Design a protein around this ligand. Structure first.
Ligand SMILES: CO[C@@H]1C(=O)CC[C@@](C)(O)[C@@]1(O)[C@@]1(C)O[C@@H]1CC=C(C)C
Ligand SMILES: [Co+2]
Ligand SMILES: [Co+2]
Ligand SMILES: [Co+2]
Ligand code: NA
Length: 304
């Protein structure tokens, strides 16, 4: 394998972390290849679930607990801390809230969150690498509670970063919020990519094509598919009671991605940095509820 940048994996990983049996487990948790029977049963559908009031309560709960856990991770971002150490804390924070860490054994994913540094786009595997001053790192939290998943991510700065890093992360957050600000009944899912790419391109950045926002509720991902680039072919129209994520991945260089031999770590093919932010959204009559919002601050952590 030819690495695209400076980052490398830092192995071995610590033994897989157990989740006590009193925590309710998704179906894939105990599948030997981490496949989800419930996902495979709905695989190939484009029907978008309209959530019941029960579903809404379930999504509000798991999304706010997910936020609490991301906030735990945010409080640990400093030079010297390893991404494995963040994952350990995230794992304990999930259990402390009677939640299962959704990534764990998802298609045999080995950890309890995704930690994406610099040229990593998404799905980085927590490992023994200490964060370095100047790094950008995204922590992506997915939790599972009472049958529902919730999903959010932020990119953080590690100590002082360069101006490129500041501009990339700010622009990405702006992309996310502009997209969110357009969500309401009657808008085509395909429109959000036009808004995101417009802002990205205006700032000299590109938009990752191979990963998308997604429906989420009783499945970790389902319809709709929500691409972040312009003139995409996404199917479907927003309606009150839809829940989905928006999670733009923006890049300093070109948009092309490739995957490490681990089968998960997605990286820019050119080795330049990529940043991401993500919320889980519930469409309402007036617009949307941001289920994963920060409750104790108007702003994401990088703005501190
Ligand atoms: C729609 O896919 C999703 C996508 O494109 C955006 C990035 C991911 C990670 O959310 C995604 O790739 C998922 C859901 O397949 C990945 C499996 C999830 C975990 C936490 C390992
Ligand atoms: Co996510
Ligand atoms: Co997501
Ligand atoms: Co899947
Ligand atoms: Na990155």
């Amino acid at each position: 394998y030819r690495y695209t940048g400076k980052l490398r994996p830092h192995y071995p990983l610590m033994p897989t972390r157990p989740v006590p049996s009193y925590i309710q487990r998704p179906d894939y948790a105990d599948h030997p290849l981490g496949m989800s029977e419930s996902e495979q049963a709905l695989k190939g559908t484009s029907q978008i679930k309209l959530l019941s009031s029960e579903d809404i309560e379930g999504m509000r709960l798991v999304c706010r607990l997910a936020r609490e856990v991301l906030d735990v991770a945010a409080g640990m971002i400093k030079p010297g801390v390893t991404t494995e150490e963040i994952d350990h804390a995230v794992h304990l924070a999930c259990i402390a809230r009677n939640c299962y860490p959704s990534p764990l054994n998802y298609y045999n994913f080995p950890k309890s969150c995704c930690t994406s540094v610099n040229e990593v786009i998404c799905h980085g595997i927590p490992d023994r690498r200490p964060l370095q001053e100047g790094d950008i790192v995204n922590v992506d939290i997915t939790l599972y509670r009472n049958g529902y998943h919730g999903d959010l991510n932020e990119t953080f700065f590690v100590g002082e970063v360069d101006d490129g890093a500041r501009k990339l992360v700010q622009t990405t957050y702006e992309c996310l919020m502009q997209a969110i600000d357009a969500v309401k009944p009657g808008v085509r899912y395909r429109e959000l990519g036009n808004i995101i790419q417009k802002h990205a391109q205006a700032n000299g950045f590109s938009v990752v094509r191979s990963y998308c926002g997604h429906g989420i509720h009783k499945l970790l991902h389902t319809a709709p598919n929500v691409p972040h680039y312009a003139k995409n072919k996404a199917v479907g129209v927003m309606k009150s009671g839809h829940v989905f994520t928006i999670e733009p991945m923006i890049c300093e260089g070109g948009w092309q991605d490739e995957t490490w031999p681990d089968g998960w770590t997605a990286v820019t093919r050119d080795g330049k940095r990529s940043a991401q932010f993500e919320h889980t959204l519930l469409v309402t009559d007036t617009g949307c509820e941001i289920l994963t919002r920060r409750l104790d601050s108007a702003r994401p952590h990088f703005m501190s």
